[PDB]
């Protein structure tokens, strides 16, 4: 067929001209698949070998089943991503290769009950949870500081404040510092079509502060869309679990005390107001250290300031170059 080869060259010429175009948005995956073995790829031999929890930077539009995108790997190539509707077609192929996919058990029972597949055997049913295969994400995952204790205190707010002095100096003109006043741990997506849409409903959600949350969330989407990082100073997030289920999924930059014994020595050197909060400060520290290592992306446990700055700077420099 001449058409398949002609459209392949036509797509490649479109791919070649797409290396100098602005980035629109990004997507997040949660399932393992190979994009080269699929027969629906517009370009053959240039598929994507992505895995679970992989981020793709979609810039332009191609069709309703494939989207042009780029990975986060250094020196990568422009690839294609199946659409959630297209992913819905390829996921049905996985469960059809087995003996059965619906209700009828095939335990040596053939020829008596044909059992045509009902609606429960398809994706129309099973809508109690309906986890979305693809979650839309900003251009880059935000970087935030978590721990080692309750935010806002003299010991904790001041220590993380010292980091942002170095981050701004090194990354002038490419990152921005923003103070997140509103809460972020209550970012829900599958609660309602538009909770608290109007301020005159006089409802429990409408009159509360839930409405303000979405304004800050959309502010993050816009600022991150400009291909620039975001620096946040929210004082209501103390554990990584409060953002793992969130569709934002920021990078967890971990700062920790080397030993719990020396941690309480820090509080005793500040002032009488701090030892009053030392009782609750220690309780949060223990609940944070035993978090799984895979929940942390950046670590900062050195006792020296210089090694603390360059550990984050190297990762930021790598991430900045990663998207290009």
């Amino acid at each position: 067929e001449s058409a398949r080869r002609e459209v392949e060259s036509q797509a490649q010429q479109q791919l070649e001209r797409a290396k100098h175009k602005p980035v629109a948005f990004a997507v997040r995956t949660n399932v393992s698949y190979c994009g080269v073995l699929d027969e629906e790829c517009p370009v053959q031999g240039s598929g994507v070998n992505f895995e679970a929890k992989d981020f793709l930077h979609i810039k332009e539009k191609y069709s309703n089943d494939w989207w042009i995108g780029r990975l986060v790997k250094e020196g990568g190539d422009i690839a294609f991503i199946p659409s959630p509707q297209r992913l819905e077609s390829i996921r049905l192929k996985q469960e059809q290769k087995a003996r059965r996919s619906g209700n009828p058990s095939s335990l040596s029972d053939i020829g008596n009950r044909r059992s045509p597949p009902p609606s429960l055997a398809k994706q129309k049913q099973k809508q109690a949870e309906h986890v979305p295969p693809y979650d839309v994400v900003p251009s880059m995952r935000p970087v935030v500081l978590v721990g080692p204790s309750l935010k806002g205190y003299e010991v904790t707010d001041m220590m993380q404040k010292a980091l942002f002095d170095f981050l701004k100096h090194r990354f002038d003109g490419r990152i921005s510092i923003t103070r997140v006043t509103a809460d972020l741990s209550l970012a829900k997506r599958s609660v309602l079509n538009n909770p608290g849409k109007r301020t005159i409903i006089e409802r429990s959600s409408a009159r509360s502060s839930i409405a303000e949350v979405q304004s800050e969330i959309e502010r993050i989407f816009e600022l991150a869309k400009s291909l620039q990082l975001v620096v946040l100073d929210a004082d209501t997030i103390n554990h990584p679990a409060q953002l793992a289920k969130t569709s934002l999924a920021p990078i967890i930059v971990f700062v920790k005390v080397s030993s719990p014994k020396v941690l309480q020595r820090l509080i005793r050197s500040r002032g009488k107001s701090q030892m009053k909060h030392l009782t609750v400060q220690m309780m949060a520290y223990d609940k944070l250290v035993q978090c799984p290592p895979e929940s942390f992306d950046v670590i900062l446990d050195e006792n020296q300031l210089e090694d603390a700055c360059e550990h984050l700077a190297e990762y930021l420099e790598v991430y900045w170059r990663a998207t290009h």
Binding site: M159, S258, E302, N303
Partner: peptide, 14 residues
């Protein structure tokens, strides 16, 4: 681990 966690944590504003 205390000497670093006493100056760096304090050199910012104090």
């Amino acid at each position: 681990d205390l000497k670093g966690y006493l100056d760096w944590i304090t050199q910012a504003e104090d």
